[PDB]
């Protein structure tokens, strides 16, 4: 992901390198090339404009028009902007004594496999996870998580068809008690498109279970519709953090890049492969460095 954008940003910066001091017109041309490139990666006009303005301001503050190496000033400011556009420092959910997190999103987003990968990740960090297959309408969706839980060595409770949220609560509580589970990961129903009633039932499930986190899983190979999925889930259910899956895929990446800005929710993890350990904590500073060719 981001290959084309990466190449283009590195080219724009490299074009300045070794040619000494630049003029204001030269700087304008470079900022244009950056803003346009972002565009061509399908970043929305606002994220592009704001990003380039940030860079212009910070570069001018660093006396880019006095520098004999403006390329390095532009590199540093694009890096620092790009790192904060993605979240700044790395964040992860606050682990307290007994946690309950929803995973929400579309079918095909990576949501169900992410639930199992999270369980594995946190089991390795000493937590005691429980997976909950919460689709009350589609047994096949629950069976998928059951198998994945088996794969990662984490117990799975399956809800029953049509089970009330109160009953789900009661059964999850019981199992968590008996098995000393301290991280409960609820894989909620996924559909290929936003399903309004589901969204109603999901909001209700949230009222009854009271999750500490609601993690929206988005496929980073998709476009701006990912952020309108994000708005729909956030308005109606209320979301606390993002997981971006399939960062290993080929795609423009503009919607993924902006997700942190459009949604105002931290990216906690990113999926980087189809393997059980393809999941890892998201580090803005690391993705920014990659995109700019710094390893
Ligand atoms: N390469 C790669 N594939 C992924 C990743 N996350 C999910 N997948 C694949 O995405 C597809 C859909 O995932 P699944 O968990 O079934 O999605 P769900 O329908 O939202 O629950 C499956 O083929 C997964 O193996 C990822 O981070 N990298």
Curated annotation (Swiss-Prot):
Q: What is the E.C. number?
A: 3.6.5.4
Any GO CC annotation of this UniProt entry: signal recognition particle
General function of this protein: Involved in targeting and insertion of nascent membrane proteins into the cytoplasmic membrane. Binds to the hydrophobic signal sequence of the ribosome-nascent chain (RNC) as it emerges from the ribosomes. The SRP-RNC complex is then targeted to the cytoplasmic membrane where it interacts with the SRP receptor FtsY.
Q: What's a single GO MF annotation on this record?
A: ATP hydrolysis activity
As for family, the record states: Belongs to the GTP-binding SRP family. SRP54 subfamily.
Domain comment, as recorded: Composed of three domains: the N-terminal N domain, which is responsible for interactions with the ribosome, the central G domain, which binds GTP, and the C-terminal M domain, which binds the RNA and the signal sequence of the RNC.
Q: What is this protein called?
A: Signal recognition particle protein
Subunit architecture = Part of the signal recognition particle protein translocation system, which is composed of SRP and FtsY.
Q: Which GO biological-process labels does this protein carry?
A: SRP-dependent cotranslational protein targeting to membrane
Give me the reactions it catalyses. Answer: GTP + H2O = GDP + phosphate + H(+)
Q: Which keywords has UniProt assigned to this entry?
A: Cytoplasm, GTP-binding, Hydrolase, Nucleotide-binding, Ribonucleoprotein, RNA-binding, Signal recognition particle
**Top-level class of the enzyme under EC nomenclature:** hydrolase
Natural source organism: Thermus aquaticus
């Amino acid at each position: 992901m981001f290959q084309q954008l990466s190449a283009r940003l590195q080219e724009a910066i490299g074009r300045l390198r070794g040619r000494g001091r630049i003029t204001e017109e030269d700087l304008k041309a470079t900022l244009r090339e950056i803003r346009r490139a972002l565009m061509d990666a399908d970043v929305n006009l606002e994220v592009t404009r704001d990003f380039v303005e940030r860079v212009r301001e910070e570069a001018l503050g660093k006396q880019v028009l006095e520098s004999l190496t403006p390329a390095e000033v532009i590199l540093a400011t694009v890096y620092e902007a790009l790192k904060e556009a993605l979240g700044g420092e790395a964040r992860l959910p606050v682990l307290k004594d007994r946690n309950l997190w929803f995973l929400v999103g579309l079918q095909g987003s990576g949501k169900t496999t992410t639930a199992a990968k999270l369980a594995l990740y946190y089991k390795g960090k000493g937590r005691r996870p429980l997976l909950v297959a919460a689709d009350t309408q589609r047994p096949a969706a629950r069976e998928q998580l059951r198998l994945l839980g088996e794969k990662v060595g984490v117990p799975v409770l399956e809800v029953m068809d049509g089970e009330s949220p109160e009953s789900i609560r009661r059964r999850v509580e019981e199992k968590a008690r008996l098995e000393a589970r301290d991280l409960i990961l609820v894989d909620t129903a996924g559909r290929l498109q936003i399903d309004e009633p589901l969204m109603g039932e999901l909001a209700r499930l949230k009222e009854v279970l009271g999750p500490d986190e609601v993690l929206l899983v988005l496929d980073a190979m998709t476009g701006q519709e990912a952020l309108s999925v994000a708005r729909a889930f956030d308005e109606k259910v209320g979301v606390t953090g993002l997981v971006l899956t399939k960062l290993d895929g080929d795609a423009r990446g503009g919607a993924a890049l902006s997700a942190r800005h459009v949604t105002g929710k931290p990216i906690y993890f990113a999926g980087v492969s189809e393997k059980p350990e393809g999941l890892e904590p998201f580090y803005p500073e690391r993705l920014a460095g990659r995109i700019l060719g710094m390893g």
